[PDB]
Amino acid sequence: SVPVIPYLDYDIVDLGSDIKKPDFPQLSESHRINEQQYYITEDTPLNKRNFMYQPCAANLMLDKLKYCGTDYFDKSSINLMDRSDKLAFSLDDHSVSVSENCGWRSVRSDVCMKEGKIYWEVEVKNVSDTSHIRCGISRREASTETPVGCDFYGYSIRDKGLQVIHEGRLHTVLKPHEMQAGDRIGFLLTLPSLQSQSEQAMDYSLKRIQELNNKFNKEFYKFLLRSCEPTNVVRDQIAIRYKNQLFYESTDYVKTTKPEYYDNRDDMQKFYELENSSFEVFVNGVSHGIAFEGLTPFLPPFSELQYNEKFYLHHEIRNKYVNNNRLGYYATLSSFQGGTASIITEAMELKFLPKDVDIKTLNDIYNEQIASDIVWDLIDEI
Amino acid sequence: AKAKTRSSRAGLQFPVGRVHRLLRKGNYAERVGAGAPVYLAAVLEYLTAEILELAGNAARDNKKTRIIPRHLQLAVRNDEELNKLLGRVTIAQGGVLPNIQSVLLPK
Amino acid sequence: TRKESYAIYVYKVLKQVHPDTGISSKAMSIMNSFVNDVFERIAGEASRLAHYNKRSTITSREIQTAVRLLLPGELAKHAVSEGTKAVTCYTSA
Amino acid sequence: KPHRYRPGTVALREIRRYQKSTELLIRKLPFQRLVREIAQDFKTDLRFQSSAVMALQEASEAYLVGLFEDTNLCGIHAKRVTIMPKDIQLARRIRGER
Amino acid sequence: KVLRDNIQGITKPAIRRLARRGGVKRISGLIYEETRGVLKVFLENVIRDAVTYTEHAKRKTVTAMDVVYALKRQGRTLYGFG
Amino acid sequence: STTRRYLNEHVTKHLLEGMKLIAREKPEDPLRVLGQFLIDAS
Amino acid sequence: PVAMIGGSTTRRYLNEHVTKHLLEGMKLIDPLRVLGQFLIDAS
Amino acid sequence: SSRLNRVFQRRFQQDIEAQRAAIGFESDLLSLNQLTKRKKPVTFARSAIHNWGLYALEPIAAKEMIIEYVGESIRQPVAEMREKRYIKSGI
Amino acid sequence: MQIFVKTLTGKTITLEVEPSDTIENVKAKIQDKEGIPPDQQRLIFAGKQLEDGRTLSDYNIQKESTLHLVLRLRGC
Numbered sequence A: 001s002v003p004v005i006p007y008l009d010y011d012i013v014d015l016g017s018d019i020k021k022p023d024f025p026q027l028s029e030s031h032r033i034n035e036q037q038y039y040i041t042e043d044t045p046l047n048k049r050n051f052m053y054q055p056c057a058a059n060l061m062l063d064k065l066k067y068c069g070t071d072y073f074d075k076s077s078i079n080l081m082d083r084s085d086k087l088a089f090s091l092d093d094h095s096v097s098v099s100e101n102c103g104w105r106s107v108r109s110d111v112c113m114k115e116g117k118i119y120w121e122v123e124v125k126n127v128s129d130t131s132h133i134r135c136g137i138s139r140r141e142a143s144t145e146t147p148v149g150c151d152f153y154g155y156s157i158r159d160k161g162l163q164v165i166h167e168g169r170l171h172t173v174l175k176p177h178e179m180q181a182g183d184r185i186g187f188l189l190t191l192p193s194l195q196s197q198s199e200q201a202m203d204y205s206l207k208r209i210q211e212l213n214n215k216f217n218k219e220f221y222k223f224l225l226r227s228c229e230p231t232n233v234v235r236d237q238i239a240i241r242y243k244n245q246l247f248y249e250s251t252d253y254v255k256t257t258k259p260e261y262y263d264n265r266d267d268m269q270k271f272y273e274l275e276n277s278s279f280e281v282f283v284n285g286v287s288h289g290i291a292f293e294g295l296t297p298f299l300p301p302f303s304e305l306q307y308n309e310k311f312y313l314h315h316e317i318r319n320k321y322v323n324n325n326r327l328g329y330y331a332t333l334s335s336f337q338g339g340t341a342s343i344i345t346e347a348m349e350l351k352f353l354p355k356d357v358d359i360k361t362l363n364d365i366y367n368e369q370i371a372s373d374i375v376w377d378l379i380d381e382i
Numbered sequence B: 001a002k003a004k005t006r007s008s009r010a011g012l013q014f015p016v017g018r019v020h021r022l023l024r025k026g027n028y029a030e031r032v033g034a035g036a037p038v039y040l041a042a043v044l045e046y047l048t049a050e051i052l053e054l055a056g057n058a059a060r061d062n063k064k065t066r067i068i069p070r071h072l073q074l075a076v077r078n079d080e081e082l083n084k085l086l087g088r089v090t091i092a093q094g095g096v097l098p099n100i101q102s103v104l105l106p107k
Numbered sequence C: 001t002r003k004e005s006y007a008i009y010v011y012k013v014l015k016q017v018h019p020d021t022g023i024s025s026k027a028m029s030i031m032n033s034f035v036n037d038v039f040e041r042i043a044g045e046a047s048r049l050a051h052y053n054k055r056s057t058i059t060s061r062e063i064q065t066a067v068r069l070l071l072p073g074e075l076a077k078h079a080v081s082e083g084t085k086a087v088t089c090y091t092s093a
Numbered sequence D: 001k002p003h004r005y006r007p008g009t010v011a012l013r014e015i016r017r018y019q020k021s022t023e024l025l026i027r028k029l030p031f032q033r034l035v036r037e038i039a040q041d042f043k044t045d046l047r048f049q050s051s052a053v054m055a056l057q058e059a060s061e062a063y064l065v066g067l068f069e070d071t072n073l074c075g076i077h078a079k080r081v082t083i084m085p086k087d088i089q090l091a092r093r094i095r096g097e098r
Numbered sequence E: 001k002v003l004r005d006n007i008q009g010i011t012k013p014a015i016r017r018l019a020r021r022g023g024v025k026r027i028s029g030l031i032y033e034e035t036r037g038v039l040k041v042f043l044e045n046v047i048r049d050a051v052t053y054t055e056h057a058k059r060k061t062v063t064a065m066d067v068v069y070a071l072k073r074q075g076r077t078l079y080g081f082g
Numbered sequence F: 001s002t003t004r005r006y007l008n009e010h011v012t013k014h015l016l017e018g019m020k021l022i023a024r025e026k027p028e029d030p031l032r033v034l035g036q037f038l039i040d041a042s
Numbered sequence G: 001p002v003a004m005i006g007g008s009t010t011r012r013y014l015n016e017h018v019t020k021h022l023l024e025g026m027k028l029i030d031p032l033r034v035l036g037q038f039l040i041d042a043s
Numbered sequence H: 001s002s003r004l005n006r007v008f009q010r011r012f013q014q015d016i017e018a019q020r021a022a023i024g025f026e027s028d029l030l031s032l033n034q035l036t037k038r039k040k041p042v043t044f045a046r047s048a049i050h051n052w053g054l055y056a057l058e059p060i061a062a063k064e065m066i067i068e069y070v071g072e073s074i075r076q077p078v079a080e081m082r083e084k085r086y087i088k089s090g091i
Numbered sequence I: 001m002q003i004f005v006k007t008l009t010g011k012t013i014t015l016e017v018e019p020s021d022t023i024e025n026v027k028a029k030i031q032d033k034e035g036i037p038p039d040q041q042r043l044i045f046a047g048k049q050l051e052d053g054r055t056l057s058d059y060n061i062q063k064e065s066t067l068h069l070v071l072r073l074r075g076c
């Protein structure tokens, strides 16, 4: 219903120019802590109104699509889209740092955790009695304004004693220990396989179409939920010119209630929990146990993307319960009142690296995100 | 408040140097009392304060920072006793008060 | 050449009631010419009034009978009160 | 048959538009060429300051508007909604102009 | 050159716009010449007093103060031009 | 979504597996190994 | 060249390196064996 | 009616401004708001439409500001905790 | 220890004092923070007007109390 937005002068690069096609994150002088000037982004968009953003690049060879999605930084790092407007980071240590008059925020790094084993460490610089941080894991659903842990879209641990955070509650289930100005936390997140994920997601799609559906029309929400595939993508990602640059708006997931399903076996409303998950933390190398084992399964039938419920029902038509390759848990970080935390990406900057062959570095799946982004859109280019 | 600049001594903003000059080179009477320009500058400042207050009020209620003559007509004519002082006068570039007589509305 | 007006003295009162606002020049020429009317209207009436009684001085007592005539209703009572309060402060200090 | 507005509901729009704006309502060139005609009868070869044609225009257009407020009251008083020249010539007669 | 009948430049919409602003709803067609017969009477007086202030100053240009003083004289004081 | 249905059913599983293969580390002729991985699945 | 036109990460050398010839292989396309050779033809 | 008020608050900048000369610092002399020199008489009592309402004690006319809304300044996240916590205790 | 000297129209300050400080010692600290002379200051605690020669311990002023300051601006 809308035409493809045409290119502009800076969009057609040439061999010689060394400028970077997603226009650089313009930084702003935030404050001085840890003997370092950190910086908030000033002129690059943030994720709002239940959107996620990504700088597009005009890709000249492509015909139906005229653009490609792109990230800014070379290796894996924080995507500056799902963060807060007072959340500062410097080009020196990549530690996120809010000012002392700013509160509990959240910052997500762009690497998705979908299946397999991913491990990385997170450096912690300045955690005083007055400045705090909450490191851990979250989906794309967890609002980066609130700190991770109020909901079932993220989990983390406290700074002092590492009280494990879910539903806002503080749980002393691990070994209690406090952060200081020099620790580093490592994350053995064991995930189920995408085959095992797909069947438990398909099971709920069958267990939700009619099994509790005996609202004024229940066929079309069943029809949308027929039409509920495990790994298939429905993406509406469109190029836009914002602030004199070029970007994508991607449809984002909404908050919803707890996935409950009546198993006739044990006679109790059972919770959907992922298979064989483990949330192990390193405290300077030592292991501390499994914080959570029952991670949510999310892939079609637990994440509702943004949907026009009065436009589509009346009628060609998209679906709520889809994938968009951004679906899963992320490297999630928070900061409070000057509490600084830095994310470590590569094996060369890791000190306590366990010896598993299934472990791949944080930069690795980032490249697999680089691998997935173009070729899924090449498939959508036909 | 101060001791120089005779308006400072009364604690005003409007000058009593300029007024006391203009009461003698204006030929209002022979000898101008030395109290007189002070009292006259006090009345002038009060009116300029009152008409700039209702002007500024109606400038924020139309979202604009500075004051253009359309606000000054709305400050005067909507008032009950500043319109009466300024009854015969006409403010340039200054619109009308919106009203429509009743029988002109439909029914 | 130097052609005096009340441009600044109106501005210094705008910063006392509404300290964040400014004023367009076309609506400064109005205020420049509003005060020059009330001046020549009060000093006018306060000079027919020092001449009906055969005085030859404009005291501060003519300027308050002149204000109690021209200014109507509640502008009379207030501009008398802020009148006398600013001449008392003059004589005392 | 297209969207035709009823007779009256462009009047009560043009009322509320024009009362809400401040701009001059008589085109400047057919007013400058009117003043210079009427000024001829008293002196020949008069230049006019550019401001002093605006200064004439701002008072004439605020006379007639103040007259049409005073006119329209007479119409309403006569149980009409139409102003006719037996209404202008009452507002002028009562105010003591003719 | 010497001109005549510029008053038909005070045109029929520009009479009804003034009328609209003064809040009138229906205008009889006989008005549009009556108003040009009022506006000529007004402008005659104001310019006749204004030229007289100019003529007195041994000047040949009707400045803005004259129009303001001619309007102040007939009791129609104009704030805005000094 | 007919051209989508075919490719996403059959091709995508091993196509992405060969595509995230070269994302790990590149040889100077990666297109050959992209060819090589597609033969091994069949 | 066209490495930078698909944005700027160094691991998106693929935009220069692999993408154009695979999409020209894919846009003619059917089993995976013909696509097994259609990624060989560029070298 | 609203005359005296507007002259009352006019006396407060006729007093406070004389001795604020070096400092300066907010300390409650920072004009001691704006948007207060117009507030109104308005009170609160048992409402006809709920527990507590607000009543104009003066015949206020057509387009005239009553009162600014005052309170805390909190962002959207911390709003949602407060929106649920008060209801969790049942305010 | 810390106090508030929260002034009549609505805003607060944060001072550092001792309970052994005189009220005039506290009135000096307000003047250092506001320039307002100590003679025009009245310090009010539990409704009681405190005297310049007396100390904070005398009036049971504790940690993080709110004191009340009511300036009298001169003249005119």
Ligand SMILES: C[S@@+](CC[C@H](N)C(=O)[O-])C[C@H]1O[C@@H](n2cnc3c(N)ncnc32)[C@H](O)[C@@H]1O
Pocket: H049, H050, H051, H052, H053
């Ligand atoms: C913005 S607050 C108003 C405060 C309320 N007047 C009081 O006494 O606390 C929202 C409240 O208005 C009340 N309310 C909302 N709509 C109402 C209505 N139509 N009639 C009566 N009360 C209503 C509800 O009780 C709700 O707690």
